[PDB]
Amino acid sequence: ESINSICLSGPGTPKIPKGITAEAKVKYSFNFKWGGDLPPMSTITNPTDQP
């Protein structure tokens, strides 16, 4: 807490009221393609299905 207090003496450091937590977030979208030979697949009975 003492070295944080020395850093808080420096410029640009924010004022946050006691008991408040400040937060920041980014939304990301990474773009990929997946490549391969054709995969296998499986199926469901018609009678026992979404009615």
Binding site: P47, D49, Q50
Partner: peptide
């Protein structure tokens, strides 16, 4: 059609 209806 629902697949349950047309199945048979």
């Amino acid at each position: 059609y629902f697949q349950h209806n047309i199945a048979n």
